[PDB]
Amino acid sequence: ESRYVLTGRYDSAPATDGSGTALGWTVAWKNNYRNAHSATTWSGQYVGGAEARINTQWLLTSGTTEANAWKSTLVGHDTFTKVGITGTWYNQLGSTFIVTAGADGALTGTYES
Amino acid sequence: SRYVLTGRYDSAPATDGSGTALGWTVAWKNNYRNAHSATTWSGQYVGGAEARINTQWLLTSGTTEANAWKSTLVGHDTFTKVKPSAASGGGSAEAGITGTWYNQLGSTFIVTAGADGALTGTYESA
Amino acid sequence: SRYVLTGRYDSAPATDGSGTALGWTVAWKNNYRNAHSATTWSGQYVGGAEARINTQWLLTSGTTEANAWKSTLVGHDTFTKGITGTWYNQLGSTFIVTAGADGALTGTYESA
Amino acid sequence: SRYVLTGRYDSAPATDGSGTALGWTVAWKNNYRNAHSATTWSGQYVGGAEARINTQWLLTSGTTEANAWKSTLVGHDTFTKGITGTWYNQLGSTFIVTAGADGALTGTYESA
Ligand SMILES: O=C(O)CCCC[C@@H]1SC[C@@H]2NC(=O)N[C@@H]21
Ligand SMILES: O=C(O)CCCC[C@@H]1SC[C@@H]2NC(=O)N[C@@H]21
Ligand SMILES: O=C(O)CCCC[C@@H]1SC[C@@H]2NC(=O)N[C@@H]21
Ligand SMILES: O=C(O)CCCC[C@@H]1SC[C@@H]2NC(=O)N[C@@H]21
Q: Mind giving me the DSSP string for A24-55?
A: EEEEEEE-SS-EEEEEEEEEEEEE-STT-EEE
Can you give the residue range of the structural domain that contains B54? 1-126
- If one counts every other C-beta atom within 10 angstroms of the C-beta of residue D66, the result is 9
Whole-number Å distance between alpha carbons of A60 and A93: 15
Compute the residue count for chain C.
Answer: 112
Residues touching ligand 1 (Cβ under 6 Å) are A 29, 36, 38, 40, 58, 60, 62, 76, 78, 91, 93, 95, 113; C 69
Q: Which residue positions of A form the known binding site?
A: 4, 42, 58, 70
Instruction: Identify all chain C residues contacting D19, using CB atoms and an 8 Å cutoff.
Output: 62-65, 68
Q: Which chain C residue's Cα is nearest to B55? A: C75
B84: cis peptide before it, omega within 30°? yes
Resolution for this experimental structure (Å): 1.8
Give the SS3 label for residue D107. Answer: strand
Q: Indicate the annotated binding residues of B.
A: 3, 41, 57, 69
Total structural domains in chain A?
A: 1
Q: How far is the CA of C70 from the centre of ligand 2 (A)?
A: 27
What separation in angstroms does the CA of C109 have from each of A73, C6, C29, C57, D25? 22, 10, 11, 14, 16
Three state DSSP letters for chain C = CEEEEEEEECCCCCCCCCCEEEEEEEEEECCCCEEEEEEEEEEEEECCCCCEEEEEEEEEECCCHHHHHHCEEEEEEEEECCCCEEEEECCCCEEEEEECCCCEEEEEEECC
SS3 state at B78? strand
Whether chain A has a CB inside 8 Å of the CB on C91: the answer is: yes
Cα separation, D72 vs C76, in Å, equals 12
- CA distance to A51, C26, C72, D32, per residue, from C5 (Å): 43, 5, 19, 27
Residue type, position C54, single letter: N
Q: How far is CA D51 from CA B119, D83, D84, in A?
A: 43, 9, 11
Separation of CA C3 and ligand 4 centre (Å): 27
* β-bridge partners, A80: A54, A91
| Nearest atom in ligand 2 to B107's CA | 14
The experimental method is X-ray
Distance CA B19, CA B9 (A): 11
**Residues forming beta bridges with residue A77, ordered by sequence position:** A57
Question: Count of CB atoms within 10 A of residue D32's CB?
Answer: 6
From the CA of A86, how far away is ligand 3's center (Å)?
A: 40
DSSP code of residue D13: -
CATH of the domain at D4: 2.40.128.30
Is the CB of residue A97 less than 8 Å from the CB of residue A61?
A: no
Query: In one letter, which amino acid is B94?
Result: E
Coil, helix or strand for B65? helix
Distance (Å, rounded) from C-alpha A71 to C-alpha C47? Answer: 28
Interface test with B, best of C56, C57, C72, C89 (most B CBs within 10 A): C56
